[PDB]
Design a protein around this ligand. Structure first.
Ligand code: HEC
Ligand code: HEC
Ligand code: HEC
Lengths: 261, 134
């Protein structure tokens, strides 16, 4: 049910309802995980990693983490240590301003920077399966930690660009993200129960397509489905939108990989 | 003869008093268009009990012909925003002013002329169906 507690593996408390972030307080009485809009049967699939088909890909990425790839003969682990330590906390604070880049970066951009510049290995396609499994492994080791993305300082202009996109109507159907997820959350579009369109559970394992789904893949499909032209994955526009949408869920726990419709 | 998008007479309340085409509306086709996910896809947002798994974003259209005049129902279909400012209901007879319109769901930009989501005849067919909802 919507107000039931989510615990994972009997061990990990997930905050699924939280006070609305100050920047969004005008619009919601509280913020809620997408988990809280799912039926009981689907909710149960996220409560035990043994039942969460998304975690099969995570276990594969755990092996990839230790596997040398690229001309330099190194594995992620050779520089970052055990993934449970070296990636701890990271999902909760990206996208963030990155000192070396003078820009807000996403986790995916960081991973590909190490692959190319430090490993001598091929970049992973931004929303492909290899990248999305690794981002899911990174999310999984911070489950239960509050999403805490900064929205001011050097990230402000990026956050503002994302806010602008969130409320811009797109496509011939002429809808913004807010049209559905802010104005009409808890309503239904056909059989789908509209959530607040949060991303604290990404990458999501969708029962519909039986794979992990990257944030920018979801975003692309949402603008497409307004009968519109999405921005490119990895584009400045979707990096901005991701920072902004992540901040609409500040205070909810990291949940990825979550199980969703 | 159909009145082209640019030409519809629209009063101050968003009502449209005259049909968009001289062809009579076929309510049977109207029914099909509304549940055609490729055309009206109206059931995504609206329940009609006369007609599975309707959305709840819009109100039930049960009874709409008993409460709203034909001209108002037609106005809702031509450009819902004229009737319900800032509604999320799509404008089915508009061809201008979209941000990043794509060719259906192919993610490709529309180059050249933009056609309306429904034709004048499709709209009168749908209107004819809605008018049976008393
Ligand atoms: C040494 C040759 C490395 C290998 C192999 C990999 N990474 Fe890396 N990574 C490296 C450095 C020197 C840094 C910057 C650290 C800093 O504090 O500035 C990074 C950073 C990342 C990050 C961002 C970390 C953070 O604290 O914000 C990520 C997400 C990351 N690296 C991922 C990653 C993965 C998935 C790798 C295997 C494919 C990998 N790195 C290998 C150095 C090296
Ligand atoms: C109505 C026509 C929508 C518009 C416009 C946008 N979204 Fe959407 N989204 C919609 C549905 C019916 C669903 C599935 C049910 C639900 O959980 O809401 C979604 C889902 C998402 C999600 C996934 C949520 C999760 O896994 O917990 C995200 C992240 C999402 N939508 C984002 C999003 C954005 C950023 C949009 C503007 C570009 C947007 N959606 C528009 C319906 C609709
Ligand atoms: C959601 C994205 C919608 C789709 C798709 C369609 N309609 Fe709609 N409609 C919608 C809303 C939210 C509303 C209420 C106005 C508001 O913005 O609050 C409506 C209303 C109507 C009405 C008037 C009914 C009434 O007010 O009692 C009619 C006659 C109507 N809509 C018809 C209609 C048709 C025929 C559609 C498919 C072509 C259709 N709507 C799609 C939201 C949405």
């Amino acid at each position: 049910g919507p107000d039931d507690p989510l615990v994972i593996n009997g061990e990990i408390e997930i905050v699924t309802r939280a006070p609305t972030p100050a920047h969004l307080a005008d619009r919601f009485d509280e913020i809620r995980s997408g988990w809280t809009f799912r039926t009981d049967d689907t909710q149960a699939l996220e409560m035990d990693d043994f039942e969460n088909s998304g975690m099969v890909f995570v276990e594969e990425a755990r092996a990839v983490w230790d596997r040398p790839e690229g001309t330099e003969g190194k594995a992620c682990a050779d520089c970052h240590g055990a993934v449970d330590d070296g990636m701890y906390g990271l999902r909760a604070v990206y996208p963030k301003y990155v000192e070396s880049a003078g820009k807000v970066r996403t986790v995916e951009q960081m991973i590909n920077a190490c692959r190319t510049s430090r490993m001598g290995a091929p970049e992973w396609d931004y929303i492909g399966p290899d990248m999305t499994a690794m981002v899911a492994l990174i999310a999984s080791v911070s489950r239960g930690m509050p999403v805490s993305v900064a929205i001011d300082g050097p990230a402000q202009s990026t956050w503002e660009k994302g806010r602008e996109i969130y409320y811009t109507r797109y496509g011939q159907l002429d809808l913004s993200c807010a049209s559905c997820h802010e104005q009409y959350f808890d309503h239904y579009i056909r059989a789908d129960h509209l959530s607040q369109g949060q991303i604290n559970g990404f990458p999501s394992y969708r029962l519909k397509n039986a794979r992990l789904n990257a944030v920018h893949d979801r975003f692309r499909g949402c603008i497409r489905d307004t009968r519109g032209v999405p921005f490119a994955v990895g584009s400045p526009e979707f990096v901005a939108l991701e920072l902004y949408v992540a901040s609409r869920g500040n205070g909810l726990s990291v949940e990825g990989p979550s199980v969703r419709n | 003869a159909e009145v082209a998008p640019g030409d519809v007479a629209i009063d101050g309340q968003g009502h449209v008093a005259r049909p968009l085409t001289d062809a009579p509306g076929d309510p049977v086709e109207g029914r099909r268009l509304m549940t055609d996910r490729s055309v009206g896809n109206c059931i995504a947002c609206h329940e009609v009990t006369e007609m599975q798994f309707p959305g709840t974003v819009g109100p039930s259209l049960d009874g709409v012909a008993a409460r709203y005049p034909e001209a108002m129902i037609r106005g809702i279909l031509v450009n819902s925003k004229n009737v319900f400012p800032e509604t999320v209901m799509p404008a089915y007879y508009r061809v201008e002013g979209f941000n990043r319109p794509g060719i259906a769901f192919t993610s490709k930009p529309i180059e050249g002329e933009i056609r309306p989501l429904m034709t004048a005849g499709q709209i009168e067919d749908v209107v004819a169906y809605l008018m049976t909802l008393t």
